[PDB]
Amino acid sequence: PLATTIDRLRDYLDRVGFQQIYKYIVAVNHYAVTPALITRNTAASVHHFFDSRLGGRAEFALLQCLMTGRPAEHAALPDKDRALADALVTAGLLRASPDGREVSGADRQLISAFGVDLLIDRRIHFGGEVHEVYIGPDSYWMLYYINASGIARTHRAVDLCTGSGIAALYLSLFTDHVLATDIGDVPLALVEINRRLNRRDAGTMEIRRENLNDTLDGRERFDLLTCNPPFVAFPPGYSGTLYSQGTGVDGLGYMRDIVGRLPEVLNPGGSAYLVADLCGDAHGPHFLGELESMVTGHGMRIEAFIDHVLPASAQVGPISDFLRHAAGLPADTDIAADVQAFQRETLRADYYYLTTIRLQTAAQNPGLRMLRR
């Protein structure tokens, strides 16, 4: 039943040109920048666009339920859309009002990214409950740097720590062989939905419940790898979330795990694309110093694209707020002092550098290249 409901959702999105509507609303100079475009802060302007520039047409009513959560009167939905709305309510992907007279948003927000149609966790952009599936601008910038024209239909690709599935689904635009992995129940259920929503199935995209270190140890070899792993370092004693908290003393343990196995897991000449918000000093991120061992030790070419720089002081608030909300802590806990001390003493973080890293084995021009503006 869920698979049929997603097929009917796909049909609706095609019928009313969802991806084109989304692309027009956000425009080409924002579409690939961030998924945080339609949010609680911009929803009223989205509604005004549908009401005034699209004339309030009923064929777009269900679409707005999915995009912003806006209510639509059940009886005002066109007949085909109405039955689909009922199926989405049954699936928990939309809500009905208590009297059943309207349909509105649940916890899933419909966006488009990199040519794919994607349900994401609505709580990241709306409302006040902590989200359970991550997506963000780092997700996008990882994909931005992939040279799509170099992907062959027979290339074997893996998206580790797939989350919503965005990177795996992007790769599936080009290759017929994609593996997508995660260990969280909630993201695994969501990438199943998003795979079907883009007319993929197990014939070209495998979804696997598997720890990233277990995939990295395995004998499967890949031509292309993507991974946006948990990479944030929180002070000792604080609980984070599955998608946020990195391993190791400085949160970069998973990045180390991946990089160390790339000479074995990648076929010769294969490429990995990673992204992380990396601690550093004024010169650059500390992690890049660890990568010279891969240039010399394995002849790799490693390119680091630094696309955002923030002083560590500008992250104290966001980190502290996230920790307070995730664990349900009260407002008299001095989290900010703990974060500041941890940044200074353990991370040596004067700055955070949002960095996409491309790593290629068996490079003809080996070396480390760090790009900063």
Ligand X SMILES: Nc1ncnc2c1ncn2[C@@H]1O[C@H](CSCC[C@H](N)C(=O)O)[C@@H](O)[C@H]1O
Interaction site with Na ion (CB under 5 A): 228, 231
The answer to whether 45 contacts ligand X (rule: CB under 6 A) is no
**Alpha helices for the chain (secondary structure H):** 2-15, 18-26, 43-48, 61-67, 79-90, 137-144, 166-172, 185-197, 212-217, 253-265, 292-298, 313-327, 335-342
Q: CB 129 → ligand X: shortest distance, Å?
A: 18
Dmax (CA) of the chain? 67
Looking at the DSSP bridge assignments, the partners of residue 180 are: 159, 207
Q: Which is nearer to ligand X, 158 or 316 (CB)?
A: 158
Cβ atoms of 35 and 139 within 8 Å: the answer is yes
The footprint of ligand X on residues 241-260 (CB under 6 A) is 242-243
- For helices 185-197 and 2-15, give the axis angle rounded to 10 degrees: 50
In 3D space, the residue among 172, 69, 204 whose CA is nearest the CA of residue 125 turns out to be 69
The answer to whether 240 contacts ligand X (rule: CB under 6 A) is no
Of 16-24, 89-97, 175-183, 292-300, the segment contacting ligand X by CB under 6 A is 175-183
Of 19-27, 103-111, 132-140, 359-367, the segment contacting ligand X by CB under 6 A is 132-140
The answer to whether 194 contacts ligand X (rule: CB under 6 A) is no
The answer to whether 166 contacts ligand X (rule: CB under 6 A) is yes
Cβ atoms of 19 and 95 within 8 Å: the answer is no
Pick from ligand X, Na ion, none: which does 162 bind, CB < 5 to 8 A by kind?
ligand X
Of 15-23, 148-156, 227-235, 346-354, the segment contacting ligand X by CB under 6 A is 227-235
# chain residues binding ligand X, by CB under 6 A:
21
Q: Which is nearer to Na ion, 93 or 252 (CB)?
A: 252
Cβ atoms of 95 and 89 within 8 Å: the answer is yes
Instruction: Report the residue from 182, 250, 277, 338 that binds ligand X according to the rule CB under 6 A.
Output: 182
Q: CB 63 → Na ion: shortest distance, Å?
A: 30
The answer to whether 64 contacts ligand X (rule: CB under 6 A) is no
| Alpha carbon distance 336, 324 (integer Å) | 10
The answer to whether 139 contacts ligand X (rule: CB under 6 A) is yes
Q: Which is nearer to ligand X, 161 or 252 (CB)?
A: 161
The answer to whether 211 contacts ligand X (rule: CB under 6 A) is yes
The answer to whether 18 contacts ligand X (rule: CB under 6 A) is no
Alpha carbons within 13 angstroms on the beta-carbon side of residue 129 total 8
Q: CB 27 → ligand X: shortest distance, Å?
A: 22
| Alpha carbon distance 273, 68 (integer Å) | 31
Q: What is the DSSP letter of 221?
A: -
The answer to whether 315 contacts ligand X (rule: CB under 6 A) is no
In 3D space, the residue among 201, 203, 202, 225 whose CA is nearest the CA of residue 212 turns out to be 225
